[PDB]
Design a protein around this ligand. Structure first.
Ligand SMILES: Nc1ncnc2c1ncn2[C@@H]1O[C@H](COP(=O)(O)OP(=O)(O)NP(=O)(O)O)[C@@H](O)[C@H]1O
Lengths: 352, 12
C-alpha cells in the first residue's frame, strides 16, 4: 500500500510505526510523534533528506555516529533507523527516538521556572555535558531548543549534527557560512578566533541557557555578527587587556580596541530575583576569556548544585570518540555511502 | 535515593 503522509509529505515508516502527529520542523528535519506497534510505545521520529547537499550529509552522519556511540541518561538515544534497502533508493532517513514532551525553548514561551527546576535542569545539562566532554567531543550548538524535557523534569540533550572532536587547530570558515537557527548561544572566541574549537565553547552556551532560564529572555540576542558581539560587550563590559591577550585573531583585537568603551553591568541588576549562588557560576560560565572560563567538572562542583553533585553517579565515556576522516573534505556521494553503512545494523539481514 | 522530585510541570 501507499506510505503514510503528514502535511503533504511522505513519512514512510509503516507498518511498524503508525498514528503520526506533526511536532515540529528544525532547519534540517521534520519531527513527528508516532506509535511503535512492535514495542507498544510512543516514539519520536525525525525525517531527514540530506542527500542533495554536502553539509546536510555531514550533519546527519555525525549525529548518527555520535548518538549511537553515546549511552547516557541525559542524552537522547537512537532506537531505530529506517531507510531503503538499496543505496540508490535511499532518499530519506528516519531516526527513531524516545518521545519527549517538549523542549526548553517551548517551555519558556509558556512559563516561568521555579529556582528548584532551574537548578535541576542545569544539573542535568552539565551531567550530560561532562559525559560528552569526557569523550573529548564538543556539542557546539547547545541551546534551549536542543534540550528535551518531560513532565517529570527529565532532560535530554539532542541534536549533535554540529558536534566534533575537540581540536585547538581547525579553521572556522565553514561553521559560520553554514546556517543555524539562532547564534545567541555562541562563545565569543568562535566569532573572533581564526582557529579551532575547545570545550569552553559548550560552557558558554550553558551559561547563556542558565541566564535564559532565569529571565525567560535570551541574554545575548542580536541580528548579525557585529550586532551580536555588541550585546555581549554591553553586559560583560569592554575586554581587559589581559582578555585581548589570547587566541583572538588580529583584525579582531584591532576591531575591539576600535570600540568605544563599555561598562560591566552587575549580574544582580540584570537578574534581581535570582538566587545569588546561581549568579555566581553564571559569572564563572559567561567569562569572555576561554582560559579562565569554568570547566564542566568544576561547574558541577559549584555550591549552586551542591544538593545534586554526585561524582559517583556521573558516568564518563570509556574512551575518546574519533572520526577517521575530516567530514568537511568528503563530497555528498561519499557521505551517502557512509550513512548507508552506518545504518545497516538496523537492517533485517545485516552481517556485522 | 537518586532521582529528585520536585513538583510536576505543566506542558501546553
Ligand atoms: N525525541 C524528541 N521527542 C520530542 N520532541 C522532539 C524530539 N526530538 C526533537 N523534537 C522536537 O523537534 C524539534 C526539532 O528537532 P531537532 O533535532 O533540533 O531538528 P534539527 O533540524 O536536527 N536541529 P535544529 O534545527 O537545531 O532544531 C525540536 O526542537 C524538538 O522540539
Amino acid at each position: 500500500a501507499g506510505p503514510e503522509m503528514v502535511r503533504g509529505q511522505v513519512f514512510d515508516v509503516g507498518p511498524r510505526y503508525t498514528n503520526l502527529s506533526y511536532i515540529g520542523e528544525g532547519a534540517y528535519g521534520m519531527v513527528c510523534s508516532a506509535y511503535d506497534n512492535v514495542n507498544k510505545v510512543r516514539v519520536a521520529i525525525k525525517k531527514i533528506s540530506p542527500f542533495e547537499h554536502q553539509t546536510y550529509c555531514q550533519r546527519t552522519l555525525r549525529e548518527i555516529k555520535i548518538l549511537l556511540a553515546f549511552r547516557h541518561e541525559n542524552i537522547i538515544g537512537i532506537n531505530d533507523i529506517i531507510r531503503a534497502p538499496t543505496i540508490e533508493q535511499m532518499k530519506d532517513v528516519y531516526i527513531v527516538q524516545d518521545l519527549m514532551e517538549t523542549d526548553l525553548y517551548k517551555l519558556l514561551k509558556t512559563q516561568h521556572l521555579s529556582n528548584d527546576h532551574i537548578c535541576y535542569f542545569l544539573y542535568q545539562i552539565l551531567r550530560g555535558l561532562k559525559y560528552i566532554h569526557s569523550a573529548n567531543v564538543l556539542h557546539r550548538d547547545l541551546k534551549p531548543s536542543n534540550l528535551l524535557l518531560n513532565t517529570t523534569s527529565d532532560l535530554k540533550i539532542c541534536d549533535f549534527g554540529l558536534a566534533r572532536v575537540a581540536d585547538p587547530d581547525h579553521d572556522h570558515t565553514g561553521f559560520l557560512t553554514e546556517y543555524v537557527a539562532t547564534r545567541w548561544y555562541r562563545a565569543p572566541e568562535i566569532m573572533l578566533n581564526s582557529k579551532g574549537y575547545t570545550k569552553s565553547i559548550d560552557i558558554w552556551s550553558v551559561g547563556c541557557i542558565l541566564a535564559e532560564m532565569l529571565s525567560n529572555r535570551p541574554i545575548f540576542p542580536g541580528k548579525h555578527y557585529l550586532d551580536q558581539l555588541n550585546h555581549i560587550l554591553g553586559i560583560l563590559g569592554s575586554p581587559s587587556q589581559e582578555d585581548l591577550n589570547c587566541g583572538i585573531n588580529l583584525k579582531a583585537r584591532n576591531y575591539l580596541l576600535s570600540l568605544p568603551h563599555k561598562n560591566k553591568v552587575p549580574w544582580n541588576r540584570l537578574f534581581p530575583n535570582a538566587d545569588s549562588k546561581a549568579l555566581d557560576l553564571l559569572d564563572k560560565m559567561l567569562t569572555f576569556n576561554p582560559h579562565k572560563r569554568i570547566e564542566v567538572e568544576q561547574a558541577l562542583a559549584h555550591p549552586y548544585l551542591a544538593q545534586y553533585y554526585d561524582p559517583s553517579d556521573e558516568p564518563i565515556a570509556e574512551a575518546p570518540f574519533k572520526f577517521d576522516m575530516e567530514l568537511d573534505d568528503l563530497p555528498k556521494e561519499k557521505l551517502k555511502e557512509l550513512i548507508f553503512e552506518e545504518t545497516a545494523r538496523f537492517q533485517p539481514g545485516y552481517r556485522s | 535515593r537518586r532521582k529528585p522530585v520536585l513538583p510536576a510541570l505543566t506542558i501546553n
